[PDB]
Amino acid sequence: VKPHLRHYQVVGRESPSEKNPEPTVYKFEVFAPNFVVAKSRFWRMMRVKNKVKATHGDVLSCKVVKDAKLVARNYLVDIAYYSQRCGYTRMVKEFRDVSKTGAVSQAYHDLASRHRARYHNIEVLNVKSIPDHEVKHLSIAQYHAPNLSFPLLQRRTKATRKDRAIFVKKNTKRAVVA
Amino acid sequence: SKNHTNHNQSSKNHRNGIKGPVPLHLHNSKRGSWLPALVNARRVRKHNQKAALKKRRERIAAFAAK
Amino acid sequence: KNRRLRLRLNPYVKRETAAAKGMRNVANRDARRKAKLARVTKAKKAATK
Amino acid sequence: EYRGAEKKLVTLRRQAASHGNYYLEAKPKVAVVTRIRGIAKVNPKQRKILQLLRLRQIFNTVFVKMNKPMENMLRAVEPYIAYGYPSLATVRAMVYKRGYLKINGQRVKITDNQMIKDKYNNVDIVCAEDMVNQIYTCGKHFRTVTHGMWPFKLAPPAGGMRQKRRHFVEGGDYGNRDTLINRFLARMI
Amino acid sequence: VHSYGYKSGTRHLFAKKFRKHGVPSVSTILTNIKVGDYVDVVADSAVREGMPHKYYHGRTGIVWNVTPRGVGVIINKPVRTRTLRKRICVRFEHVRKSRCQEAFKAKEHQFQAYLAAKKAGKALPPLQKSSRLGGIVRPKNVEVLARRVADY
RNA sequence: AGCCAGAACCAGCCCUACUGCAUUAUCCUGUCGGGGGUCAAAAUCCGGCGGGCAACGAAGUGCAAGAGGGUCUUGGUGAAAUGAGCGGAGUAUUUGAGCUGGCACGGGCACGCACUCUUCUCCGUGAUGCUCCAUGUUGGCGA
RNA sequence: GAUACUUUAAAUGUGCAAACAAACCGGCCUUAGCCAACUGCAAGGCCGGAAAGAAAAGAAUUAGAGGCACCAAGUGGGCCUUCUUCGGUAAGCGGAGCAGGCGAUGCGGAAUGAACCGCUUAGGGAUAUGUGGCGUCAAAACUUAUGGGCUCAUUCUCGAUACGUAAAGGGUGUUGGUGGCCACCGGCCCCGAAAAUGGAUGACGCUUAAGGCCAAUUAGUGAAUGCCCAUUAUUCCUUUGGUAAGGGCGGAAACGGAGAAAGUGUAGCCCUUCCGAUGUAGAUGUGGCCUGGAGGUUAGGACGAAGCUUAUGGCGUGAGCCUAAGAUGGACCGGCCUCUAGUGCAGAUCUUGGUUGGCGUA
Ligand SMILES: [Mg+2]
Ligand SMILES: [Mg+2]
Ligand SMILES: [Mg+2]
Ligand SMILES: [Mg+2]
Ligand SMILES: [Mg+2]
Ligand SMILES: [Mg+2]
Ligand SMILES: [Mg+2]
Ligand SMILES: [Mg+2]
Ligand SMILES: [Mg+2]
Ligand code: NA
Ligand code: NA
Incomplete structure (x- = not known):
């Protein structure tokens, strides 16, 4: 139902010292299941780009960015992932959703299914909602058509959990067992 | 037929612990030291023992007085 | 959980319970939230000027 | 005192945000540590550290100061423990429901303030709220109060764990889970 | 098994540092050693008289005996x-004065100075504050930390 | 009162009840221009400036304090019941929330430090008892 | 160098110190010690002072009582694993370093397995978990969801629980990605893929999966734990033992019941409290059990001793003890304290006696 990843903004810096009395402050955007994982990702980014370890750093702020109103939009997601054979690979993919967190959760599930890529091997470069006339894939473009309509066929409909039965009369609704 | 290993030896050595060394102030013998200094120190110690005996006699006399 | 043990260890717990019930009272909560929001937004608007 | 401290912190954060600066929180002073693995196939160094921390049995819990010697000790036994930063409610619950004293060598349940006063023989520790204050604020008598108590023996967490063998960041359980240790301990106390 | 001599396996242990060959100096000769001092035992490979066994090459001990050219040292083993x-006997070329107690001696000296000032009534220095407290941070530069296309 | 049942009450323990404070801005809303598309016009989208609380279950953000059911998982039926729960005395006490008059906090004070709504309060039973055991209600079965 | 020896140089290590027989500040005595000499230096002492008893700066912690002897057992064939490795084409092969295990050990899981995963053990309840699971076998989604992708496999055959028993190269089969209808890189699937009794995701079976990747907890409603299973954890009852910890023990008086021992060990002098409890070889303890005989003491028996028989119960954790019945027997013998030994049997191709299936067979 609801997306399994939340949107976090983490702001931090290196602790001041006599060499660097006023360190630079950095802002970071991450999608993570909780704020502890969010802080872990922040400190990894600081270590690999700015040569700052968590053991000499301060975390100024860590919050969750709220989603907008639920509206059906097109989201472009710029993402990257690693594998041993190919190496590091960068993709740009379009999704249909009602929120940024929803689109990014979609992207993570999609990468897990089509490339066997796991959470800690993935970096999200960007995600944003784009207008209807910039959609390139026809499988996404088909949902702009103003006359869209289709029937529901081959449905697997289950009864309410209280009314499920094991054996029922063939042309009726009476339950014989359960 | 001739096997060698140290596999269980540290575990054996730590059951009753590695005991610490004896403190520096105990077993502080001077035997084998540089001879002239030793010979002088002996004379000083003999004089010191004489002084200790005299001091005890004086203390006993003072207590008897008061 | 115990009433007797809790009060024995902390004789002051009844006053805390009174404050809790007061804060959970509906009218007090409504007035307090309404007044608090006015107190904050007004103070921020004044201080930013 | 507690209520005033919280209000003052709220005002400081508001004042920083209004002009667009940032407020640095004080680093935590107290950590709560619980053992999550049994007693089997443990190396001598880890065995020694766990003994010195008084965690000799699974789901034993203690409070420690979060300074440099303690942190370097804690880092060496990470696969065996789960720890974090406690809250006042957690400290109160542990003391009032699971708190025992060392009296005459024995493990004795806390049942009145008189036995606390007799154990400690100090005018600053006479009641359970005094013990709670010292533990929570890391006061001058933190070591006296914590050393005077038996280690806390807790039940397994109702609802289960996730994975003993992985770090909390990898979706497991061991390591530092920060303020989220309180939700973990609410199901064990 | 086959060869176990007094100096076996000392190829890198008993060797001089690069561009630092030579013999002891007048500073080594003019150093005074008393009974009860802490010393470091470091073998000097250019002397070769009175050299300790390789086991004692990095240890610290107490002097228990002084001779015209030698020192006796107590070392735990x-x-x-x-x-x-163990009591080892070496030439004075192979020992150095240890600095293992400098911090403790300094602490005692500072305590004496503080006592003197407190009795004198002089104003005391301001005590240092902790670095782990809170405060408001006024930033000069803010940036965006990100992983970009050019990075890979 | 021996055996076997059922219900009630008391102590303890174990479950489920009853819950507030902070934070929202990469957000909400009205216009102007663009861009879009239709059989015409709306929207998705971007940039100007006007206001702001998405506030009935708005966040699935951080921390939370708020008597009904079991005990064939325990002991008992008051042979010293220590109780905010059993007794005596009155109606007030003092906990918070709003609103009030030196220093701290920031470049004014969101309300830190010192001096109207909302709840029940004070008092009591030592062991001339060192230890153990002997105390309810309603049926079935046993003359 | 040759065509790995080395300036540089980690991680993991390793020695010493961090105020009570110690060290710091000034009186003095003594030395046939050094020095040209001593009012300097070296050494041993005596008399005094100081002492946040070790501040502040992240500025330790302890289920933290130190030291010293005596007497003696078993063992001196090992093996497995993790990370380093030397020999060897390789080995369930030989040799080593550090740690953990099995041997000496079960229990809960991986269908099965000395050594893998979880957990480590007094006799029992309740609650909750670990590893592993939730179509049936088989407890749990009576086949959960108001989650998203992908996959079709025809004689060993799609696939599906680690440790543990197939490669290059091809494929318009299908699903996507990068750069320019093309060239390359992915995901599942298919060729490549050939042995000896009939047979193995454990079996059946499964394809709007009961498969493979990811993600939930009753679902864009509005607030921490879906469910099942341990010799583990929490808690309650009972036992036993402690380097155990407290209390009572001059009969208050009167007349619901009884008892009340100054105590290692008992049917424990009596209460209360806390912690531990598995184990081969081996050590030790026991008002611990049993058998023949001696010194004492106290009893029994022709109204029936010893011995023998048992759907004869009772007591004891146990070795065992005691009662009942004999439609058994016919003359000796039980308890307690000391003493003493030819003193306890399931197995030695054990000794001696007697039975026995094969067999009414050859
Ligand atoms: Mg699990
Ligand atoms: Mg492991
Ligand atoms: Mg053997
Ligand atoms: Mg095992
Ligand atoms: Mg079933
Ligand atoms: Mg006992
Ligand atoms: Mg045993
Ligand atoms: Mg015999
Ligand atoms: Mg026999
Ligand atoms: Na199976
Ligand atoms: Na005999």
């Missing part, structure tokens, strides 16, 4: 379940 106190 664990054997099986106990620690022995």
Whole structure:
């Protein structure tokens, strides 16, 4: 139902010292299941780009960015992932959703299914909602058509959990067992 | 037929612990030291023992007085 | 959980319970939230000027 | 005192945000540590550290100061423990429901303030709220109060764990889970 | 098994540092050693008289005896379940004064100075504050931390 | 009162009840221009400036304090019941929330430090008892 | 160098110190010690002072009582694993370093397995978990969801619980990605893929999966734990033992019941409290059990001793003890304290006696 990843903004810096009395402050955007994982990702980014370890750093702020109103939009997601054979690979993919967190959760599930890529091997470069006339894939473009309509066929409909039965009369609704 | 290993030896050595060394102030013998200094120190110690005996006699006399 | 043990260890717990019930009272909560929001937004608007 | 401290912190954060600066929180002073693995196939160094921390049995819990010697000790036994930063409610619950004293060598349940006063023989520790204050604020008598108590023996967490063998960041359980240790301990106390 | 001599396997241990060959100096000759001092035992490979066994090359001990050219040192050595106190005899070229107690001596001296000032009534220095407290941070530069296309 | 049942009450323990404070801005809303598309016009989208609380279950953000059911998982039926729960005395006490008059906090004070709504309060039973055991209600079965 | 020896140089290590027989500040005595000499230096002492008893700066912690002897057992064939490795084409092969295990050990899981995963053990309840699971076998989604992708496999055959028993190269089969209808890189699937009794995701079976990747907890409603299973954890009852910890023990008086021992060990002098409890070889303890005989003491028996028989119960954790019945027997013998030994049997191709299936067979 609801997306399994939340949107976090983490702001931090290196602790001041006599060499660097006023360190630079950095802002970071991450999608993570909780704020502890969010802080872990922040400190990894600081270590690999700015040569700052968590053991000499301060975390100024860590919050969750709220989603907008639920509206059906097109989201472009710029993402990257690693594998041993190919190496590091960068993709740009379009999704249909009602929120940024929803689109990014979609992207993570999609990468897990089509490339066997796991959470800690993935970096999200960007995600944003784009207008209807910039959609390139026809499988996404088909949902702009103003006359869209289709029937529901081959449905697997289950009864309410209280009314499920094991054996029922063939042309009726009476339950014989359960 | 001739096997060698140290596999269980540290575990054996730590059951009753590695005991610490004896403190520096105990077993502080001077035997084998540089001879002239030793010979002088002996004379000083003999004089010191004489002084200790005299001091005890004086203390006993003072207590008897008061 | 115990009433007797809790009060024995902390004789002051009844006053805390009174404050809790007061804060959970509906009218007090409504007035307090309404007044608090006015107190904050007004103070921020004044201080930013 | 507690209520005033919280209000003052709220005002400081508001004042920083209004002009667009940032407020640095004080680093935590107290950590709560619980053992999550049994007693089997443990190396001598880890065995020694766990003994010195008084965690000799699974789901034993203690409070420690979060300074440099303690942190370097804690880092060496990470696969065996789960720890974090406690809250006042957690400290109160542990003391009032699971708190025992060392009296005459024995493990004795806390049942009145008189036995606390007799154990400690100090005018600053006479009641359970005094013990709670010292533990929570890391006061001058933190070591006296914590050393005077038996280690806390807790039940397994109702609802289960996730994975003993992985770090909390990898979706497991061991390591530092920060303020989220309180939700973990609410199901064990 | 086949060869176990007094100096076996000392190829890198008893060797001089690069561009630092030569013989001891007048500073080494003019150093005064008393009974009760802490010393470091470091073998000088250019002397070769009165050299210690390789086991004692990095240890610290107490002087128990001084001779015209030699020093006797007590050094702890664990054997099986106990620690022995071994007495070794070396030439004075192979020892150095230890600085293992500098911090403790400094602490005692500062305590004496503080006591003198407190009795004198002089104003005391301001005590240092902790670095782990809170405060408001006024930033000069803010940036965006990100992983970009050019990075890979 | 021996055996076997059922219900009630008391102590303890174990479950489920009853819950507030902070934070929202990469957000909400009205216009102007663009861009889009239709059989015409709306929207998705971007940039100007006007206001702001998405506030009935708005966040699935951080921390939370708020008597009904079991005990064939325990002991008992008051042979010293220590109780905010059993007794005596009155109606007030003092906990918070709003609103009030030196220093701290920031470049004014969101309300830190010192001096109207909302709840029940004070008092009591030592062991001339060192230890153990002997105390309810309603049926079935046993003359 | 040759065509790995080395300036540089980690991680993991390793020695010493961090105020009570110690060290710091000034009186003095003594030395046939050093020095040209001593009012300097070296050494041993005596008399005094100081002492946040070790501040502040992240500024330790302890289920933290130190030291010293005596007497003696078993063992001196090992093996497995993790990370380093030397020999060897390789080995369930040989040799080593550090740690953990099995041997000496079960229990809960991986269908099965000395050594893998979880957990480590007094006799029992309740609650909750670990590893592993939730179509049936088989407890749990009576086949959960108001989650998203992908996959079709025809004689060993799609696939599906680690440790543990197939490669290059091809494929318009299908699903996507990068750069320019093309060239390359992915995901599942298919060729490549050939042995000896009939047979193995454990079996059946499964394809709007009961498969493979990811993600939930009753679902864009509005607030921490879906469910099942341990010799583990929490808690309650009972036992036993402690380097155990407290209390009572001059009969208050009167007349619901009884008892009340100054105590290692008992049917424990009596209460209360806390912690531990598995184990081969081996050590030790026991008002611990049993058998023949001696010194004492106290009893029994022709109204029936010893011995023998048992759907004869009772007591004891146990070795065992005691009662009942004999439609058994016919003359000796039980308890307690000391003493003493030819003193306890399931197995030695054990000794001696007697039976026995094969067999009414050859
Ligand atoms: Mg699990
Ligand atoms: Mg492991
Ligand atoms: Mg053997
Ligand atoms: Mg095992
Ligand atoms: Mg079933
Ligand atoms: Mg006992
Ligand atoms: Mg045993
Ligand atoms: Mg015999
Ligand atoms: Mg026999
Ligand atoms: Na199976
Ligand atoms: Na005999």
